[PDB]
RNA sequence: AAGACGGACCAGAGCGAAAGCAUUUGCCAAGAAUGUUUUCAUUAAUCAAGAACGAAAGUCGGAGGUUCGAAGACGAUCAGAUACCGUCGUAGUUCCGACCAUAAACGAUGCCGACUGGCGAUGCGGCGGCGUUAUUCCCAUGACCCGCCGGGCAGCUUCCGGGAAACCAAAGUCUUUGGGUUCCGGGGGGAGUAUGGUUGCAAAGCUGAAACUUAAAGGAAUUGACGGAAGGGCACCACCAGG
């Protein structure tokens, strides 16, 4: 797995999961995400399993790892809370950030304003990124999607359960998934955690 | 009304009350009143008068089931409807015997052997008397103490006890011996909290011009048939071995032996039946009755004035703060232990009626004062710079909670009357204790509780006089080298055969170096010395020096 | 009377102190009726109870008195109880009555002492006790709010004068002495600091002299070393008012000094043999400590405490029979 | 006074085989759901015949006719209106006891049984809750919340699958064709006419053709165009104010 110890959640991670609120989920019944739910709050708010978060945080990184290019890894964030995060994901991982609208046709559409050639897609919310997920399904593209307890799961390959909506739960996973790949391939090597905080991350919060 | 004919519809009109109860939803007001409609419509007699017999058997069953139905704890007027018709059914039964029980005298309308079992319905009539008794048990429990109406409901106990006579007299002792677990206990149930006050009106009313007719020679014997039937069914609780009730009876016999008889028997029967162990397996609400019993042992230790037994019957009780919950009245946040409310609901739906509550302020004045006259001359030996028997966890420690009170003015609390009399006991003046105890327990009505309390006071008069004479001798011991017997007979108001029993036991049992000439009535002591009491105080120290030095080698080897 | 009082908390914290003070008058008219509602049936049940015969009820009196059923009359006892929702709410209001409490410094602090002394002498001495602990806390925590409240405007000095009376009356009448005298001693000590805050007022100190003079009776009843403190504090704080107020009581002051001489030394030997084993030095410390409260820190002896009154020229001023005695 | 009818409350709700059922209250037996270590031991399934029920108008005979109201007629309407319209009104409506047996009795959609997906309600019963509220001195109630169980009403939602599409967890598990049982169609007519049967008091109901006629009829869906369909904008070849 790599260095198995910090790959079994450290309290630095564990607090940040609580700090970004990733453990929380929605209120909706699942049939593909209820495995990733730890428990539910009084009259229903789902505590997700951070074990399921981390173990999918490892393997979806390991899907990106041993691709010799982050250039054919197009990471996707239509949410503005992750647009700083995929900016700081592409700053750290080197992947291809996708902010905002997909502009339908980058994967189809010979005659088009653009064309991209990825291999794996990473998604903040497959409902907010369904237009990537359509053209992921069109031209044989696997897709990692951050899924909460209300997310869609059709055409969704390996899914990391997170709260991943609104809060810093978005920018923590991009802090963590860029952690996990530099943990595997980088100068934060040999499965060491980061020394870079998620304050280079979490989204802008227009300032004073 | 329902149907205007005889017997045949009426049993079906009887069974329709018997059938309609067994539902998840059932009102039972109509079930009661139609039975009275079937009383009057059975104007035929033994074609219908026997129908009333099962109607009165089923009125009470309809009256009883009517009030775990809305509230709660049956209303006592609904219970007095039970009290009316149980009386009325026995009024029928005294005129009845074994008719509509049938037993092939006739069959229609007869035969409680027709469905079913002619004694069992008669036996369940006795179980309807239980239903009169069970709600009255709640009525004695769930009615307020300060409420003067609680006394009004408590007046109906003799009316129940009348039926306890009237059943067993109409019995036909199938019901007696089969229910000798209970029908005998029904005789206990009106005995084991009863009083010597009526026994003073029974036995100590002089039978010279009062108990000359056979009227006071039948009702007073019924007052002591209850103290008879308990001994009559000691030997039947040899048969009816029934350790949930047998151990419970013998403790109530010990009640009768302590209160209703002489407490020498109650001391024996506790030693006799050995009820240290049976109480555990047999329903520890009987342990509450056991703890009620050894309290009442200490009561008749105090009624017989025995101070050690007032301390030693309050050994399973007053070595613990359990005695609050030994009447079942402790609070949940009284400590960090009493949890929870639902178990508190179980214990307090169970326990206890207010006439079954007792005076714990008396019990503390039983427990504290009894060792106050003991331990103070005892500690006056200790506080004479000679101590080896300092007993930890004692009335000494029950004194400590009242001792260190420099602000304490007038004695007003029950412990304050003890602690003031304790200081009066420490002065050696006997008279000063009597101001602090006897008047203040009349002020707090604690003396006002017994008819024997004048003797109990007079017993504790001499226990103050003889023992403060000892603290007179214990405290002023070094300079008393000649001690009178003529003066001390006049001083502490104690006659010579007491004083000879005092002063010899002051010389023999205390082992004071003292010459005595009882012909001359003179005690000659010469203790020698008070500066060598420090030599005794150092031999208090250095003897401990040799022991743990030896114990240093005892553990290590 | 409490849910509406929760409005009366927040609705009448709206600066109509005409309305606030009149409701304090109504806060007595709360209790003025339901004091009498018991007090009618105090007679009227006992009209019926004497009309009832105890001779026929003698086995029920055995069911009463051997049980100690103690036939109280709940006609009173429940009409006794319902003005406690009227009483205790106003005490519970009092700590929250900040920034002026002058409808209550004038009235309610003393109206509590008015209402308490009725119901304490009627039935409720234990409902007195914790309430006086409650009042002392709702004295203290109300001060510990410090939302525009001081003592030096003589706000807390009549709050003292009410609460001191609330202590000293029940103590003398019938109370446990260990507890309410601490409610007096914690009142007297703090308000000695509040007198120190409010530029020592000698007339509540003359009341404190009377609080000593009360205690001189009580410490000839309870503790001679406290009486060694208090009778020495009785006389000189009066002798200050002989100078401060210029008392022209030349028969009384010549006879209060002989009152101050004779009782003051008499401290015999202790009789407590167990208390010597039970660490007398803790007790004499409290005998010292509440004498430090009164300002006569070490409890003075037999003879040298006389000599305080002898060296001071008031022994000359004794009505001369005692002087000869 | 008369006779009529219980609005609103009143719903993707209930019950009832449908046709159906809206004042209260009572009686009467019924039926569903639910729960059920109860019982029967497979008694089950579906259905020609056969039978029940089956709106309405009609009719049979009354009551009834307040109200309305086929007919009916005007007043008005229009080239014509008998119609809509206004007026008056018969039968009818009202209701009883009959026939009638029909309806778009339509959900245009056999039964029963099986299997295949997501959610949130609601009527129901039973259950789970340190759930709330609520009464009596509080429990046990109930109102209600979360959850569950069903059998419901159904809804929403998805390459569940299909379908000509429309749409449909059924209108899926069909060419990879078969759960069982009943019913019905073979392009369009002529025509439910003829013909006979047949009932019904009749009105009419039911069973049920041929000659001849025809290469189209039909269905969805796309696209136009149209509208006395609806919603948008603009021009003095359109208005306004005007000359």
Domains of chain A: 13-208 (3.40.50.10490)
Method underlying the structure? cryo-EM
DSSP state of B384: T
What are C140's two structure tokens? 């203290």
Nearest to A156 by CA among A121, A186, A183, A190: A121
Report CA-CA distances (Å) from B52 to B10, B44, B58, B90, B131: 10, 10, 9, 12, 19
Q: What is the resolution of this structure in A?
A: 6.3
Torsion sign across C-alpha atoms B260, B264, B267, B268:
negative
Query: Distance between the two ends of chain B, CA-based, in angstroms?
Result: 99
Contact: chain A with chain B (3+ CB pairs below 8 Å): no
DSSP string, C197-250: HTT--HHHHHHHHHHHHHHHHHHTTS-HHHHHHHHHHHHHHHHHHHHHS----T
Partner-chain contact C182 B407, CB within 8 Å: yes
Backbone angles phi, psi at C177, to 5 degrees: -90, -30
Q: Residue C52, SS3? A: coil
Closest approach of chain B CAs to the CA of C266, in angstroms? Answer: 17
Is residue B86 within 8 Å of B160, Cβ to Cβ?
A: no
| C275–B contact, CB cutoff 8 A | yes
What are B274's two structure tokens? 């050995």
Torsion sign across C-alpha atoms C233, C235, C239, C242:
positive
Class of residue C114 by CB neighbours under 10 A (exposed 0-12, middle 13-18, buried 19+): middle
CA B502 to chain centroid:
35
What are C105's two structure tokens? 């410094």
Longest dimension (CA), chain C: 71
Q: Which of C62, C74, C282 lies at the smallest CB-CB distance from B195?
A: C62
| C279–B contact, CB cutoff 8 A | yes
Q: Residue B334, SS3? A: coil
- Which nucleotide across the nucleic acid strands is nearest to A32, CA versus C1'? D118
Is residue B135 within 8 Å of B151, Cβ to Cβ?
A: no
B210 CA, D15 C1': Å apart? 82
Query: How far, in Å, CA of C238 to CA of C230, rounded?
Result: 12
**Chain B contact set for C223 (CB, 8 A):** 406-407, 409
H or E segment and range at residue B524: strand B522-524
Is residue B361 within 8 Å of B338, Cβ to Cβ?
A: no
**Chain B contact set for C278 (CB, 8 A):** 399-400, 403-404
Is the CB of residue A154 inside 7 Å of nucleic acid strand D?
A: yes
Q: Pairing between strand A157-161 and A143-147?
A: parallel
Query: Taking the CB of residue B436, how many other CB atoms lie within 10 A of it?
Result: 21
H or E segment and range at residue A77: strand A73-77
Q: Which of C66, C223, C282 lies at the smallest CB-CB distance from B449?
A: C66
Q: Residue C36, SS3? A: helix
Is residue B245 within 8 Å of B287, Cβ to Cβ?
A: no
Is the CB of residue B113 inside 7 Å of nucleic acid strand D?
A: no
What are B255's two structure tokens? 């009640």
Query: Taking the CB of residue B340, how many other CB atoms lie within 10 A of it?
Result: 8
Nearest to B283 by CA among B323, B322, B241, B244: B244
Neighbours of chain C (3+ CB pairs under 8 A): B
Nucleotides in chain D with any atom closer than 7 Å to protein CB: 117-120, 126, 136-140, 145-147, 158-159
Query: Side by side, which strands form the sheet with A157-161?
Result: A96-99, A73-77, A120-123, A143-147, A157-161
Q: Chain C residue closest to B153 (CA)?
A: C60
Query: Side by side, which strands form the sheet with B515-517?
Result: B482-484, B522-524, B515-517
Is residue C180 within 8 Å of C120, Cβ to Cβ?
A: no
Query: How far, in Å, CA of C43 to CA of B485, rounded?
Result: 58
What are B460's two structure tokens? 């504790």
DSSP string, B158-215: HHHHHHHHHHHHH--THHHHHTTTTHHHHHHHTTTT--HHHHHHHTSS-TTTSTTSSS
CB burial readout B489-520, b (16+ within 10 A) else e: beebebeeeebeebbeebbeeeebebebeeee
Closest approach of chain C CAs to the CA of B454, in angstroms? Answer: 15
Partner-chain contact B406 C68, CB within 8 Å: no
C window 36-95, beta carbon within 8 A of B: 49, 57, 59-60, 62-74, 77
B372 CA, D191 C1': Å apart? 126
Query: How far, in Å, CA of A85 to CA of A51, rounded?
Result: 22
Is residue C168 within 8 Å of C197, Cβ to Cβ?
A: no
Partner-chain contact B413 C67, CB within 8 Å: no
Report CA-CA distances (Å) from C113 to A132, B303, C117, C289: 80, 45, 6, 28
DSSP string, A108-149: S-SSSS-----SEEEES-TTTTHHHHHHHHHTT--EEEEE-T
Longest dimension (CA), chain B: 108
What are C224's two structure tokens? 């001679």
Residues 6+ apart with CB under 8 A from B247: B273, B275, B278, B279, B282, B286, B290
Between C156-174 and C202-219, two packed helices, what is the crossing angle to 10 degrees? Answer: 10
**Chain C contact set for B299 (CB, 8 A):** none
**Chain B contact set for C53 (CB, 8 A):** none
Between A169-184 and A50-64, two packed helices, what is the crossing angle to 10 degrees? Answer: 50
Partner-chain contact C174 B412, CB within 8 Å: yes
Indicate the length of chain A as a whole number. 208
Between B29-41 and B49-65, two packed helices, what is the crossing angle to 10 degrees? Answer: 170
DSSP string, C260-301: HHHSSS-------HHHHHT-HHHHHHHHHHHHHHHT--SPP-
Is residue B65 within 8 Å of B21, Cβ to Cβ?
A: yes
Is the CB of residue B2 inside 7 Å of nucleic acid strand D?
A: no
Report CA-CA distances (Å) from B335 to A5, B56, B331, C12: 48, 50, 8, 40
Class of residue A154 by CB neighbours under 10 A (exposed 0-12, middle 13-18, buried 19+): exposed
Partner-chain contact C286 B409, CB within 8 Å: no
Query: How far, in Å, CA of C94 to CA of C132, rounded?
Result: 13
CB burial readout B240-263, b (16+ within 10 A) else e: bebbebbbbbbbbbbbbbbbbbeb
B538 CA, D127 C1': Å apart? 79
Indicate the length of chain B as a whole number. 557
DSSP state of A19: H
A130 CA, D232 C1': Å apart? 34
Helices (H), A139-207: 169-184
Is the CB of residue A111 inside 7 Å of nucleic acid strand D?
A: no
């Amino acid at each position: 797995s790599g260095a198995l110890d910090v790959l079994q959640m450290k309290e630095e991670d564990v607090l940040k999961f609580l700090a970004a609120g990733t453990h929380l989920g929605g209120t909706n019944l699942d049939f593909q995400m209820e495995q990733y739910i730890y428990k539910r709050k009084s009259d229903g708010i789902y505590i997700i399993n951070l074990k399921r978060t981390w173990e999918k945080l490892l393997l979806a990184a390991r899907a990106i790892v041993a691709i010799e290019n982050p250039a054919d890894v197009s990471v996707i964030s239509s949410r503005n809370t992750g647009q700083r995060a995929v900016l700081k994901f592409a700053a750290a991982t080197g992947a291809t950030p996708i902010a905002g609208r997909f502009t339908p046709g980058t994967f189809t559409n010979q005659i088009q304003a653009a064309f991209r050639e990825p291999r794996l897609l990473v998604v903040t919310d497959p409902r907010a990124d369904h237009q990537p997920l359509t053209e992921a399904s069109y031209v044989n593209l696997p897709t990692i999607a951050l899924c909460n307890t209300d997310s869609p799961l059709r055409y969704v390959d390996i899914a990391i359960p997170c709260n991943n909506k609104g809060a810093h739960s978005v920018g923590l996973m991009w802090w963590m998934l860029a952690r996990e790949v530099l943990r595997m391939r980088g100068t934060i090597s040999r499965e060491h955690p980061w020394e870079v905080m998620p304050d280079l991350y979490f989204y802008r919060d227009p300032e004073e | 009304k329902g149907t205007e004919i005889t017997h045949a519809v009426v049993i079906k009109k009887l069974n329709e009350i018997l059938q309609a109860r067994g539902k998840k939803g059932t009102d039972r007001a109509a079930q009661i009143e139609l039975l009275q409609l079937l009383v009057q419509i059975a104007s035929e007699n033994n074609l219908g008068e026997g129908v009333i017999v099962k109607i009165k058997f089923n009125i009470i069953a309809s009256l009883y089931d009517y009030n775990p139905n809305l509230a709660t704890y049956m209303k006592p007027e609904m219970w007095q409807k039970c009290l009316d018709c149980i009386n009325e059914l026995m009024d029928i039964l005294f005129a009845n015997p074994n008719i509509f029980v049938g037993e092939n005298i006739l069959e229609e309308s007869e035969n409680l052997q027709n469905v079913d079992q002619p004694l069992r319905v008669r036996g369940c009539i006795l179980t309807l008397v239980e239903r009169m008794d069970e709600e009255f048990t709640k009525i004695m429990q769930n009615t307020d103490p300060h409420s003067q109406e609680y006394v009004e409901h408590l007046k109906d106990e003799a009316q129940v006890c009348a039926i306890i006579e009237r059943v067993q007299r109409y019995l036909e002792e199938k019901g007696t011996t089969e229910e000798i677990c209970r029908v005998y206990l029904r005789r206990i149930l009106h005995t084991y909290y009863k009083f010597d006050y009526k026994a003073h009106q029974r036995q100590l009313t002089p039978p010279e011009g009062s108990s000359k007719s056979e009227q006071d020679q039948a009702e007073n014997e019924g007052e002591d048939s209850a103290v008879l039937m308990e001994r009559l069914c000691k030997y039947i609780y040899a048969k009816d071995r029934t350790d949930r009730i047998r151990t419970c009876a013998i403790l109530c016999h010990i009640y009768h032996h302590y209160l209703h008889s002489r407490w020498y028997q109650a001391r024996d029967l506790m030693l006799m039946s050995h009820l240290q162990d049976n109480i555990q397996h047999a329903d520890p609400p009987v342990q509450i009755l056991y703890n009620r019993t050894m309290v009442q042992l200490g009561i008749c230790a105090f009624r017989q004035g025995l101070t050690k037994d007032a301390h030693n019957a309050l050994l399973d009780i007053q070595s613990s703060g359990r005695a609050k919950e030994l009447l079942g009245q402790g609070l949940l946040l009284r400590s960090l232990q009493e949890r929870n409310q639902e178990q508190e609901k179980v214990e307090r739906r169970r326990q206890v009626p207010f006439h079954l509550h007792i005076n714990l302020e008396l019990l503390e004045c039983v427990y504290l004062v009894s060792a106050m006259l003991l331990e103070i001359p005892y500690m006056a030996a200790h506080e004479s710079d000679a101590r080896r028997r300092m007993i930890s966890k004692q009335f000494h420690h029950q004194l400590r909670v009242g001792e260190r009170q420099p602000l304490l003015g007038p004695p007003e609390s029950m412990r304050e009357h003890v602690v003031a009399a304790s200081k009066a006991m420490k002065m050696g003046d006997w008279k000063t204790c009597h101001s602090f105890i006897i008047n203040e327990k009349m002020n707090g009505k604690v003396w006002d509780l017994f008819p024997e309390a004048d003797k109990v006071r007079t017993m504790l008069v001499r226990k103050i006089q003889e023992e403060s004479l000892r603290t007179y001798l214990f405290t002023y011991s070094s300079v008393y080298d000649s001690i009178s017997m003529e003066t001390l007979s006049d001083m502490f108001e104690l006659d010579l055969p007491t004083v000879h029993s005092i002063i010899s036991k002051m010389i023999i049992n205390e082992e004071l170096m003292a010459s005595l000439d009882q012909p001359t009535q003179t005690v000659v002591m010469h203790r020698t010395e008070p500066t060598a009491q420090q030599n005794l105080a150092l031999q208090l120290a250095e003897k401990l020096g040799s022991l743990v030095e030896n114990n240093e080698r005892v553990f290590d080897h | 009377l409490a849910k509406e009082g929760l409005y009366q908390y927040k609705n009448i914290c709206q600066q109509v102190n005409i309305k606030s003070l009149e409701d304090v008058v109504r806060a007595y008219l709360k209790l003025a009726e339901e004091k009498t509602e018991a007090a009618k049936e105090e007679s009227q049940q006992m009209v019926l109870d004497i009309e009832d015969l105890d001779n026929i009820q003698t086995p029920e009196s055995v069911l009463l008195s051997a049980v100690s059923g103690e036939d109280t009359q709940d006609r009173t006892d429940r009409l006794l109880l319902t003005p406690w929702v009227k009483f205790l709410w106003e005490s519970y209001r009092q700590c929250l009555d900040l920034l002026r409490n002058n409808s209550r410094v004038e009235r309610l602090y003393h109206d509590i002492a008015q209402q308490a002394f009725k119901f304490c002498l009627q039935y409720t001495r234990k409902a007195e006790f914790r309430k006086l602990c409650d009042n002392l806390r709702m004295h203290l925590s109300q001060i510990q709010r410090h939302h525009n409240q001081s003592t030096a405007i003589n706000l807390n000095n009549p709050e003292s004068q009410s609460m001191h009376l609330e202590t000293r009356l029940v103590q003398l009448d019938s109370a446990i002495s260990m507890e309410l005298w601490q409610e007096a001693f914690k009142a007297v000590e703090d308000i000695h600091g509040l007198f120190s805050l409010s530029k020592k007022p000698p007339k509540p100190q003359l009341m404190a002299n009377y609080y000593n003079k009360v205690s001189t009776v009580f410490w000839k009843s309870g503790n001679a070393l406290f009486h060694a403190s208090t009778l020495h504090r009785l006389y000189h704080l009066s002798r200050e008012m002989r100078k401060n107020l210029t008392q022209d009581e030349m028969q009384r002051m010549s006879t209060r000094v002989l009152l101050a001489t004779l009782s003051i030394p008499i401290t015999p030997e202790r009789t407590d043999i167990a208390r010597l084993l039970d660490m007398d030095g803790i007790i004499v410390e409290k005998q010292r400590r509440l004498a430090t409260l009164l300002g006569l820190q070490a409890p003075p002896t037999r003879i040298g405490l006389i000599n305080d009154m002898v060296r001071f020229n008031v022994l000359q001023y004794v009505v001369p029979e005692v002087k000869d005695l």
